[PDB]
Each structure stands twice: as C-alpha cells, then as structure tokens.
Design a protein around this ligand. Structure first.
Ligand SMILES: CCNC(=O)Nc1sc2ccccc2c1C(=O)N1CCC(N2CCC[C@@]3(C2)CC(C)(C)OC3=O)CC1
Length: 720
C-alpha cells in the first residue's frame, strides 16, 4: 500500500525470515522493544531509552561512527555502538553489538567481514564495555578462480578413452595471453604433440577471499575472541546457525544463548554423510541443535525466538557492571533484607532451587514460600547439563551474585545414541546427589571462571560428600576437573561466601578444593548450626578408627551383662564345661550388641563433625541460623564490597603495603573517628557499612611517589 511507511529493505527482511532469523539492521529496534518490556509500563520510561550508531570501516580499515540509512553494508558483517538506560544505569550503559549479515553472501566470513569483527571487538576492549555477538553465518567463505574454471584444457592419457585418466591441466597460448597479466595462475611452458601448452602448477585466482586467506582471517578473529573473554563481558546469540569459525566464536565468548531449531556445527550432516558413504545423520540439528548444546554446557540457555534472545541478553547484563572498571550495580530491593527465609532445607532430598528462589506454598495456595535470594531474581544457566550442580545468577538485597548450589535428589540423565555406531543405543544413567562427577566438576569450574570475568561476588551453597572416585569417573578424568575448581577459586578477585546450609555437609576432597586458604583475601566460610563437615562420613570414620575390637572394648566397659561374663571367665579354677557355656553366652551377647554399638560409635564420630568443632578449629568464620542467614549475609557482603573499594584505593596510592597492614589501617581510622569505647562495633557489619557510607591516603601517595623517584635515580645515576 501507498499509506504505510516502508524502507527499501523489504527483500532483505523477507530473505532473513525465510532462513528463520531477523535481518541484522532490525536488532536495534528489538533492543528498544525489549528495554521497554524490561522496564515495565509506559508511565515512567526515560527520554532516550536507546541511542545507537553504526560502526563502519573507512579506507584505512579503522571504525567510524555513522548515522546512515539501514542496509548500506559493503561487507557481510555489521556493528553498532549502543547506549541504553536501565534500572541499574538510569543514565546509560554502553555495549558493542556485532553481527553477521546472513543475507550477504549467506553470512560467510571473508577478509572484510573478519576485519570488521576484529575492529569492533578491539573497540569493546579499549572502552572496557560488553561485546554482544549475533551469530547467523556459514563459516569461512569458499571460492574458486572463476576466470580459470571455464578455460582450462585437459591432457588426456588417451583422448579416445578418457577413463584411462589425464596427465595434467593446461591453458593454450591464446588463453594464457588473456590472463597472464592478472596474476591468476602459475604455469610451466611445455611442448607436446607439436603444440605449445601452458601447464598449470598453481591456481591463484585474481579475486581475493577464495581459500587459505579466509582461514588466516578466521584465526585472527578467534584469537581476538579468546582475548576478549579475558578482559570484558562477552555474550553471543545463536540464530539460524553458527558454522565453523562461527561456532568457535560463540564458544570463545563462552556465554551462549541459542534459539530453538538453530544449530552450532563444524561440518554439516550431508557433508559427513558423503564422507562416510552412507546416510548416517538426519539433520544439522542432530549434530548441533539445542538437544546437544544445551545438554553439554556449550549453550547456557535456549530461547523460542530472536526477541527472547535479546531480552535474555538484557537480563544477563542487569547483573553485570557497565564496564570492566566499575563496581557491580546494586539496586534498591523490593524484597526486604530483614525477613526470615520461609523454605526450610530438609534431611529428605529437595530441589535446591526452592532454597534459592522459594516456591509455591505446599498448603496455603496463592502464596509464595520465600527462599534465600530476592524474589524472582534467581536465573539459572547450563541447567540440563551436569544436573548434580546448579549454577546461575541472583540478587541478595539488590546485590548481584553468581550462585552455585548442589542437587540432593538422584539425577536421571538421558545419554543419546551414537548414530554412527551400530550397537550404540540410548541409555538412562543415574547420578547420586551431593557428588561432583566429571561433568559437574567441569560445570562448577566453568561457572567460576565466567562469573569471575563478569566481576561478580560468588555464593556457594556447599553440600558435597566428595568426588566420584569409581573406575569410570577416574578414567573420565574427574581429577583434572576437580583441579580446575582450585585454579578458578584461586584466581577469583571478588568476595566469595561459602555456606553449608541446614542438613548439608562438606567432606573429603570437596572441602579441599574450596577451602578459604585457596584465596584467603576473598573466601569466607560459614556453617549452619545443622550442618556437618569432616574428612569422611561418620560411618567411614568408624570403619577406619572404631572397629570390632574397639566395639568389644566398649561393651566390656559399659554393658553390665558383658562385663560380668568377662569377669566370670577370669577365674582360673573354672571347669571346661562352665568355660564353654560362658563363652557361648559371651558370643551370644556380642552378636546381640554389635549392630547398635556400631551405631553408638557412628554417633561418637558424628559429634566430631559439628559446626562447633569447625568454629573452635578456625576453619569457618561463624555459625549461622538458616532463618536469619539472608539478613546476616546481606550485611556481610555489603561490608566486604565497600571495604574492597576502599582497599583498592589504598593500594593505587601505596602498592607495597601488605593486606594485613591495610586491615589494621581501616580499623585504626574507624577508632580515631568514633572513639575506643565504640571499637567493638567494628565487628558489626551493619554499623561498619553505615560508617563507610558516611565517610566514603594523600599522605601515603606522597611517600610512595617519592620512593619510586629515588629508586629510579639510585638505579640510574645520570638523569638529575
Ligand atoms: C575422501 C573424500 N573426502 C570428501 O568427500 N570430503 C568432503 S565431501 C564434502 C561434501 C560437502 C561439504 C564438504 C565436503 C568434504 C570436505 O572437504 N570436508 C572437510 C573435511 C571434513 N572432515 C574433517 C576431518 C574430520 C571429519 C570431517 C572426517 C570424519 C572422521 C569422517 O568425521 C569428521 O568429522 C569433512 C567435510
């Protein structure tokens, strides 16, 4: 119709719709639409909720910010710089959005496409802001020298019988004359059958972007993506498909959102079928669809469509700092800090998500039974992979945290059949709760690294009996993956709060890999009054330390009947007949008592495993009560976050100062400005938070600068 407002990109939109995706130039508007929903209702939207520019390569291969009509791209990659207003950043946060244009040479990657990705990614890193990559591509571009394809000739073994084969390919002198100035081929001049021929030894092609230069280009952007993951927030959305380098780019950014019915693949199904010589695979989704990648941790989450993908991106960003040199964004909670937790962990197995997010009340219908974190704030990732562990993000009185919790129910995992292997059939496997398997140790380590790079505090609801130590799980390298937990926690740069909840336990190798001493500056450990911790289970401690001999020694000491029989069996003047009767009765009594005296010993061992011993031995900071634990940990975390902002300011003014020195300094400054009578209030987290907020070093700076300058002249006697 002539009355609506239309651009000239209708054909591109349609082409994108046919491939099951969104035209790249329509993504900015999706973000705006997603931002509005994220905000709520049209009563208090800000003025310019989203402003953006297109990032365009100039003649020198540098990016310039432009405001131009959509669809003007000369390479099959597009980039935007976007500023949007959110609850976390009402005055704006920036991101870089980079995306393949799947309507431009099927989203293949050539030199120009690679250069734009590189430059946009470099710009995200230089400014310290998140890089968002929209993946809809066909991998590295494939070409042939079109100007040679229909001019070459064949030197047959026998021109009257071509199935005998051919000796070489060649160009006639007339043809060589047409292309010798174009740098298209390398030829060797020869004579045969009395005719001059230009024998082909190499085909170069006069057009750029045919072959290996496309692989160099792919490697270039793989390296850049590897680096970006280390420096800034990286997120990808997979829509339609991600192939080859496209698949590696999404993996290297780590945080992957995959649209349902898309695929992440290296080589495709029909290619593999041709190589293997039979119809093995039914579909690319079979190789790299959500049912593979959501189930193995490559995909953090799945969405029904592009729009939910974009919305998901904004939700993830809402937990994260606006850039890599900013504090985590703490918002005003609506869920009160000073409330108890209504859901109570039990000895009986429960879904750990209820403890985090709460749940519908079991009896009082229409009511929510609150969990630990702020209502509605817990959002899980890598859910269907390695289900004995739970990983996600949440808010505690408004503070964004990474979250690790442990499943207590037995897990049923469906392992898919291998289509390439005749006798392989589908299996169901069971994984015991409260255990690290190779898969869940890996998921745990991954999550730790990802959250560290988002700069989040980490909350670990510890509940592990140990690692799976059986032959299969040992063969499958459980040991390698347990070690990554150590590396990950060691490298953590933000506070880590470890809490063993009611009826949870921390034992053996599971304690070891998460102990506070791995990162004494970040990690604090807490145990519920109803928790347990020790090298073994009490049943195991008894097996090693309180065996049959010891159980007998116990009966002798405390069972009246057993005591008498031993004392009767003492007398030497005793006949052979009385001796056989007494020791018969002693064995009878022994057999009646072993089972329960065994339980007594188990309880004896159980009393060594208490939070009480934990505290007395200094392996935890405090014993908590679940109902009031949300409140306590809120203030502890606030305090730790604030003390760290100060402590890092102290170090940029005097880098030499040890961490024990600084702790004493902060305490000293508190005592000066409140008085020695109030020094005990340093142990009060709420009071210290308030004090730091009211009081928000110059002298330290003077001395360290003067020390730096004296050193430089000491080391270099010229200069002055
Ligand atoms: C000799 C005739 N060889 C072939 O027929 N190779 C072919 S047929 C074909 C058809 C469509 C697209 C690509 C290819 C293709 C090709 O060049 N590929 C690149 C190499 C790819 N393989 C790389 C090594 C690993 C491999 C796939 C091979 C295999 C071990 C079978 O399983 C795989 O995943 C397969 C596709």
């Amino acid at each position: 119709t002539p009355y609506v407002t239309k651009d000239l990109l209708q054909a591109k939109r349609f082409q994108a719709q046919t491939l099951g995706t969104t035209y790249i130039y329509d993504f900015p508007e999706m973000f705006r639409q997603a931002l509005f929903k994220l905000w709520g209702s049209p009563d208090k939207y800000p003025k310019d909720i989203l402003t953006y520019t297109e990032l365009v390569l100039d003649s020198q291969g540098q990016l310039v910010e432009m405001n131009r009509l959509p669809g003007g791209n000369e390479v099959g990659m597009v980039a935007f710089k976007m500023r949007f207003k959110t609850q976390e950043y009402p005055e704006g946060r920036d991101v870089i959005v980079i995306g393949n244009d799947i309507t431009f040479r099927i989203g293949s990657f050539g030199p120009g496409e690679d250069l734009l990705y590189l430059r946009a990614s470099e710009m995200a890193r230089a400014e310290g802001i998140p890089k968002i990559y929209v993946a809809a591509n066909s991998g590295a571009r494939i070409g042939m020298a079109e100007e040679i394809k229909h001019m070459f000739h064949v030197a047959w073994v026998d021109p009257e019988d071509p199935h005998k084969g051919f000796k070489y390919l060649y160009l006639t002198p007339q043809d060589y004359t047409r292309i010798s100035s174009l740098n298209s081929v390398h030829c060797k001049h020869i004579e045969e059958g009395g005719e001059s021929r230009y024998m082909i030894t190499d085909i170069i092609g006069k057009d750029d972007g045919l072959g290996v230069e496309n692989l160099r280009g792919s490697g270039m952007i793989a390296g850049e993506s590897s680096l970006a993951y280390e420096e800034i927030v990286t997120i990808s959305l997979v829509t339609c498909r991600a192939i080859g380098i496209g698949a590696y780019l999404v993996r290297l950014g780590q945080r992957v959102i995959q649209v349902e019915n898309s695929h992440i693949i290296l080589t495709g199904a029909s290619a593999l079928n041709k190589v293997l010589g039979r119809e093995v695979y039914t579909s690319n989704n079979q190789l790299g669809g959500v049912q593979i990648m959501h189930y193995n941790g490559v995909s953090h989450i799945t969405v029904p469509d592009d729009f939910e993908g974009v919305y998901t991106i904004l939700e993830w960003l809402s937990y994260m700092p606006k850039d890599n040199h900013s504090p985590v964004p703490i918002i005003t909670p609506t869920d009160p800090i000073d409330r108890e937790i209504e859901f109570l962990p039990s000895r009986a197995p429960y879904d750990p998500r209820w403890m985090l997010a709460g749940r519908p009340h079991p009896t009082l219908k229409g009511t929510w039974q609150s969990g630990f974190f702020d209502h509605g704030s817990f959002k899980e990732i890598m859910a269907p992979w390695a289900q004995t562990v739970v990983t996600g993000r949440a808010r505690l009185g408004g503070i964004p945290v990474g979250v690790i919790a442990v499943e207590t129910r037995t897990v049923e995992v469906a392992v898919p059949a291998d289509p390439a292997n005749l006798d392989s059939e589908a299996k169901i496997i069971q994984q015991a709760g409260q255990v690290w398997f190779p898969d869940s140790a890996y998921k745990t380590a991954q999550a730790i690294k990802d959250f560290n790079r988002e700069k989040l505090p980490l909350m670990i609801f510890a509940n592990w009996r140990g690692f799976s130590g059986g032959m299969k799980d040992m063969y499958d390298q459980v040991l390698k993956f347990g070690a990554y937990i150590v590396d990950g926690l060691r490298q953590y740069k933000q506070p880590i709060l470890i809490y063993i909840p009611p009826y949870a336990e921390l034992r053996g190798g599971s304690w070891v890999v998460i102990d506070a001493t791995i990162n004494p500056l970040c990690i604090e450990m807490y145990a519920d009054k109803e928790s347990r911790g020790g090298v073994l289970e009490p049943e195991g401690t008894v097996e090693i330390k309180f065996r049959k001999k010891d159980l007998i020694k116990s009966m002798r000491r405390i069972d009246p009947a057993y005591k008498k029989l031993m004392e009767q069996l003492g007398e030497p003047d005793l006949s052979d007949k009385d001796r056989k009767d007494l020791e018969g009765r002693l064995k009878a009594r022994e057999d009646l008592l072993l089972p329960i005296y065994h339980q007594v010993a188990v309880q004896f061992a159980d009393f060594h495993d208490t939070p009480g011993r934990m505290l007395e031995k200094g392996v935890i900071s405090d014993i908590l009560e679940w109902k009031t634990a949300r409140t306590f940990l809120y203030w502890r975390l606030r305090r730790l976050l604030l003390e760290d902002q100060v402590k890092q300011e102290i170090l940029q003014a005097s880098g030499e100062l040890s961490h024990v020195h600084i702790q004493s300094m902060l305490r000293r400054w508190f005592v000066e400005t409140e008085g020695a009578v109030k020094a005990y209030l340093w142990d009060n987290n709420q009071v210290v938070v308030q004090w730091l907020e009211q009081h928000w070093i110059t002298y330290l700076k003077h001395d360290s600068v003067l020390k730096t300058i004296r050193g430089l002249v000491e080391e270099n006697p010229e200069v002055a």
